JSON list of C-alpha atoms in Angstrom, two decimals:
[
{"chain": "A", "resi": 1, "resn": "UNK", "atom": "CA", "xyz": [-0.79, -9.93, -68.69]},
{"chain": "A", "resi": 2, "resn": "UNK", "atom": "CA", "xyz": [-3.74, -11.59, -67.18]},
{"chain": "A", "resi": 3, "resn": "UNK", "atom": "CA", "xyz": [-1.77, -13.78, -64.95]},
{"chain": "A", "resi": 4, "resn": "UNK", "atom": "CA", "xyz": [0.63, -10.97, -63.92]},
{"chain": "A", "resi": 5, "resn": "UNK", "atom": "CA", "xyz": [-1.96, -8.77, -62.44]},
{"chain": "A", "resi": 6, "resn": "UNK", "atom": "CA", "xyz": [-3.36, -11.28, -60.57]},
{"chain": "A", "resi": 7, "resn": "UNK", "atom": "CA", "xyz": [-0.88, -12.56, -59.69]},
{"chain": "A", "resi": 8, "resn": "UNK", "atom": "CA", "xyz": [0.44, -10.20, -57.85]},
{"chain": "A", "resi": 9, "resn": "UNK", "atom": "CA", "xyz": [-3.14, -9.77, -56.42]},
{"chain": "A", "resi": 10, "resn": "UNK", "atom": "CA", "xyz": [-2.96, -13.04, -55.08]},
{"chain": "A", "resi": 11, "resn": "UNK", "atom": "CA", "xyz": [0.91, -14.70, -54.79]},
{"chain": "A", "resi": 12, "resn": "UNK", "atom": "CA", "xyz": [2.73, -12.85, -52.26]},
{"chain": "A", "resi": 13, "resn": "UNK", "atom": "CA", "xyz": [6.58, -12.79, -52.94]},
{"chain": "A", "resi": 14, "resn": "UNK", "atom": "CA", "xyz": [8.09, -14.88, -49.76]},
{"chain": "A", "resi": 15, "resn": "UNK", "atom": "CA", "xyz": [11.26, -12.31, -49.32]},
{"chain": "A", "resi": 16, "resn": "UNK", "atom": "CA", "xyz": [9.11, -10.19, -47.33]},
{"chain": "A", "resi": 17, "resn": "UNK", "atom": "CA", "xyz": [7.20, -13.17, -45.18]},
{"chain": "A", "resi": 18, "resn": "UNK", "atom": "CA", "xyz": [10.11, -15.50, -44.27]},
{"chain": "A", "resi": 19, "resn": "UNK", "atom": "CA", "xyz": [11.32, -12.37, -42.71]},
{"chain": "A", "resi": 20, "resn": "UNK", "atom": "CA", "xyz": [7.84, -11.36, -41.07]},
{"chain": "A", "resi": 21, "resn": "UNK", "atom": "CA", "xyz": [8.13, -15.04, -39.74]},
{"chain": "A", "resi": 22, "resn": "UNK", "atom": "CA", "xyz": [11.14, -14.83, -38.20]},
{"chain": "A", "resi": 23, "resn": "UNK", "atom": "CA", "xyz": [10.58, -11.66, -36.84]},
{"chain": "A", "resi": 24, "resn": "UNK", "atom": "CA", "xyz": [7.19, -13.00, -35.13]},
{"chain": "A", "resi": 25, "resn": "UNK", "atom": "CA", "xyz": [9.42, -15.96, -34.28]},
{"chain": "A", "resi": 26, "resn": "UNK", "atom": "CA", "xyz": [11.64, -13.57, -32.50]},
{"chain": "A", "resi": 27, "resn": "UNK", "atom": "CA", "xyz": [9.34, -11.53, -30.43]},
{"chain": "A", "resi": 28, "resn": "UNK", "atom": "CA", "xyz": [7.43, -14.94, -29.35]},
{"chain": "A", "resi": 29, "resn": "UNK", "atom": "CA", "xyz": [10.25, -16.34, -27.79]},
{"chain": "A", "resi": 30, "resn": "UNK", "atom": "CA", "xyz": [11.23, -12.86, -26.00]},
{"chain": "A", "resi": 31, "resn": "UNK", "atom": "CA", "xyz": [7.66, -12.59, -25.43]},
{"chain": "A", "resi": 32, "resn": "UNK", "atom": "CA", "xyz": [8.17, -15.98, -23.50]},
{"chain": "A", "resi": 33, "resn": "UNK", "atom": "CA", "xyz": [11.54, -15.51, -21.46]},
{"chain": "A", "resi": 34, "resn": "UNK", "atom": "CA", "xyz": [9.93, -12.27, -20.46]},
{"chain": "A", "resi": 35, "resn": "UNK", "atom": "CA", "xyz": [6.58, -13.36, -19.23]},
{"chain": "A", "resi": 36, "resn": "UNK", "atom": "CA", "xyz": [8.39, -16.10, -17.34]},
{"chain": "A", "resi": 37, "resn": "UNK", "atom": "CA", "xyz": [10.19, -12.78, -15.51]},
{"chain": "A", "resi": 38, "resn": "UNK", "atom": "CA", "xyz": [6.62, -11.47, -14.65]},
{"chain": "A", "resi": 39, "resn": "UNK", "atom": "CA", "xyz": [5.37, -14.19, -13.35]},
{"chain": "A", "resi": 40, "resn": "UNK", "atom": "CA", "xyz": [8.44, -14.42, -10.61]},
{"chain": "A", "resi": 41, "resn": "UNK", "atom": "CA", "xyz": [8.02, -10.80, -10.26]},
{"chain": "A", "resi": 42, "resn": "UNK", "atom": "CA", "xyz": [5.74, -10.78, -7.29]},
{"chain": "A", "resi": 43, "resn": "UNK", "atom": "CA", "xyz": [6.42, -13.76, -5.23]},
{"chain": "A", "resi": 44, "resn": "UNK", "atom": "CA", "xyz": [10.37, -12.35, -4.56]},
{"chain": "A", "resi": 45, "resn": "UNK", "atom": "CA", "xyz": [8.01, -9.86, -2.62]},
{"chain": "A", "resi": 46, "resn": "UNK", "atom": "CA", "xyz": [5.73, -11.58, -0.50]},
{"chain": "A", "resi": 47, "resn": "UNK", "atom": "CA", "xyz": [7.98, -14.37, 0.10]},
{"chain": "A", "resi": 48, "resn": "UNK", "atom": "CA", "xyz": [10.96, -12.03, 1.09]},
{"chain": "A", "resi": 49, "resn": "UNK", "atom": "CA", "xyz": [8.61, -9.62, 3.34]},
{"chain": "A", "resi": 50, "resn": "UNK", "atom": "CA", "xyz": [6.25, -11.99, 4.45]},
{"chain": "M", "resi": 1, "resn": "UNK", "atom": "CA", "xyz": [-8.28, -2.92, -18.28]},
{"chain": "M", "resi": 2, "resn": "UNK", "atom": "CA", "xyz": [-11.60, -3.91, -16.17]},
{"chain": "M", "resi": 3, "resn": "UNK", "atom": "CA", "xyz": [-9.16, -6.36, -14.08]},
{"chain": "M", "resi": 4, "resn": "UNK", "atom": "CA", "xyz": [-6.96, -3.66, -13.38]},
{"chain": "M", "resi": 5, "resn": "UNK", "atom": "CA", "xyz": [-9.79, -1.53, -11.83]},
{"chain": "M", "resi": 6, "resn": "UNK", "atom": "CA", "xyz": [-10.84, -4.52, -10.53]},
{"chain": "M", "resi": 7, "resn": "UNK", "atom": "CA", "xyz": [-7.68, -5.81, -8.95]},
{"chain": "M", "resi": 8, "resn": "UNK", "atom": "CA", "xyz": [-7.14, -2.90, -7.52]},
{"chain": "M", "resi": 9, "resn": "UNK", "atom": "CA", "xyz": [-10.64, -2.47, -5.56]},
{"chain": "M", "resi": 10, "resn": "UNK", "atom": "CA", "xyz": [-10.04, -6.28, -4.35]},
{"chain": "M", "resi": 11, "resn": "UNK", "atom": "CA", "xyz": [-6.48, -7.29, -4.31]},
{"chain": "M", "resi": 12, "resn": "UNK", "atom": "CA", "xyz": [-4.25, -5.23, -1.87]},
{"chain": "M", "resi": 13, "resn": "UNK", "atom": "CA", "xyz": [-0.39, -5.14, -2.18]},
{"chain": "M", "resi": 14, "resn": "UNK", "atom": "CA", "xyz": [0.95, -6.63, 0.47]},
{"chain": "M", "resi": 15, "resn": "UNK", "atom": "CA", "xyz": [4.24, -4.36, 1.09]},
{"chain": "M", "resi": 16, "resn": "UNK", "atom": "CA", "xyz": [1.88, -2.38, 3.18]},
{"chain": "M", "resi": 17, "resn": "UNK", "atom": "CA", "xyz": [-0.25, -5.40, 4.85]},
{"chain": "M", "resi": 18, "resn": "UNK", "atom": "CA", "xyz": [3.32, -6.94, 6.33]},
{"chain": "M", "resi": 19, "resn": "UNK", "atom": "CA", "xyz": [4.04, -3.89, 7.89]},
{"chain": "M", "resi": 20, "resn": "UNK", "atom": "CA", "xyz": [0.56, -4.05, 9.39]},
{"chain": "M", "resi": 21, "resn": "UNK", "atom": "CA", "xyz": [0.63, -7.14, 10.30]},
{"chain": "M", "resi": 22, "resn": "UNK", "atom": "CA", "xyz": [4.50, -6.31, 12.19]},
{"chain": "M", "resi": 23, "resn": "UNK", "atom": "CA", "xyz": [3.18, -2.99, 13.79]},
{"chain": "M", "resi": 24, "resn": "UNK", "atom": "CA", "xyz": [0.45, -4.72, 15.42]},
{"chain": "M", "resi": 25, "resn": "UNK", "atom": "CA", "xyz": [2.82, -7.58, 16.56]},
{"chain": "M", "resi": 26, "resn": "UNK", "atom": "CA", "xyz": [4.80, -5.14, 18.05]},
{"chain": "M", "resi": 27, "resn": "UNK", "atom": "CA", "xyz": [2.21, -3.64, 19.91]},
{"chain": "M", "resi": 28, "resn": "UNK", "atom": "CA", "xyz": [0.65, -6.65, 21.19]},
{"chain": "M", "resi": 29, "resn": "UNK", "atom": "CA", "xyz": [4.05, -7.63, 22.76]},
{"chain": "M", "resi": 30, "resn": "UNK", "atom": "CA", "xyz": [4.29, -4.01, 23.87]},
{"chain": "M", "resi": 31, "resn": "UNK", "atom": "CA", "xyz": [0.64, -4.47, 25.61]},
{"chain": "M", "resi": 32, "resn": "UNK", "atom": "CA", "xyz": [1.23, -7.88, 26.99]},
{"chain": "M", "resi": 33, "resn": "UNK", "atom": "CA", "xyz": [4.53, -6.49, 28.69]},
{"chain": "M", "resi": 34, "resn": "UNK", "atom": "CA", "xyz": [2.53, -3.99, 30.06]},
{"chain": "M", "resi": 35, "resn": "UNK", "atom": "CA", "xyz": [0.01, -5.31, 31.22]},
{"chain": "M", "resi": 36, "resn": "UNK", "atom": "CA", "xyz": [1.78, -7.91, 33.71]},
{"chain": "M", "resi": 37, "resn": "UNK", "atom": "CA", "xyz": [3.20, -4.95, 35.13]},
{"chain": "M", "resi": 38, "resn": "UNK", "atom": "CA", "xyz": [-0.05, -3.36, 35.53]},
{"chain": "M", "resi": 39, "resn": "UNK", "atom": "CA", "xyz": [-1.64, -6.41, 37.43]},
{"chain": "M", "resi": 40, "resn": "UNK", "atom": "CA", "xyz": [1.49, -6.12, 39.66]},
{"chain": "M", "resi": 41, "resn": "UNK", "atom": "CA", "xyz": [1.55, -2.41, 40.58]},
{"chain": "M", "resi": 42, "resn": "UNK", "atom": "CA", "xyz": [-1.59, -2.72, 43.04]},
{"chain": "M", "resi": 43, "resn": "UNK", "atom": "CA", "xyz": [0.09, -5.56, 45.35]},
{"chain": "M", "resi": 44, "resn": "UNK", "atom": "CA", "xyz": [3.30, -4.04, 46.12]},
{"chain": "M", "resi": 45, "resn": "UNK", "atom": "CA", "xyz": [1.53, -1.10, 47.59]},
{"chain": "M", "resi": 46, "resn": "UNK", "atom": "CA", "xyz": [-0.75, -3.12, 49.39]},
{"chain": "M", "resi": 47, "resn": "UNK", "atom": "CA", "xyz": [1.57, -5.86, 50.96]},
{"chain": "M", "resi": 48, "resn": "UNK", "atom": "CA", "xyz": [4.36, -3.16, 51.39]},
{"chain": "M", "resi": 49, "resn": "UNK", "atom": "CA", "xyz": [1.66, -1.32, 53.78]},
{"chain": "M", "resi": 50, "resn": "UNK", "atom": "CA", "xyz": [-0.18, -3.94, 55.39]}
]
């Protein structure tokens, strides 16, 4: 009984963090094809008026 | 946030610069244009008479 309390103190069941992985996996690589978008953003501008 | 404030006391958007910049293009062709005909308004009076 021991062991069962702490472990679930300490041992995390995975069912919950493979899927808080790939959901951090997800947003990083939006997070990426987005911030490519803002960088390109401005220069359209300034180019295109200038 | 202190960039923001920042970048918005040093950086200027340019949309409004290029339109400076144009304006005052235009009006230095303008004033050039002008002012040939403003050295030649003097001599045609004067030769025409004399």
């Amino acid at each position: 009984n021991l062991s069962e309390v702490r472990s679930r103190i300490e041992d995390s069941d995975y069912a919950t963090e493979v899927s808080n992985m790939s959901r951090a996996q997800i947003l990083q690589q939006a997070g990426t094809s987005v911030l490519a978008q803002a960088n390109q953003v401005p220069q359209n501008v300034l180019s295109l008026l200038r």
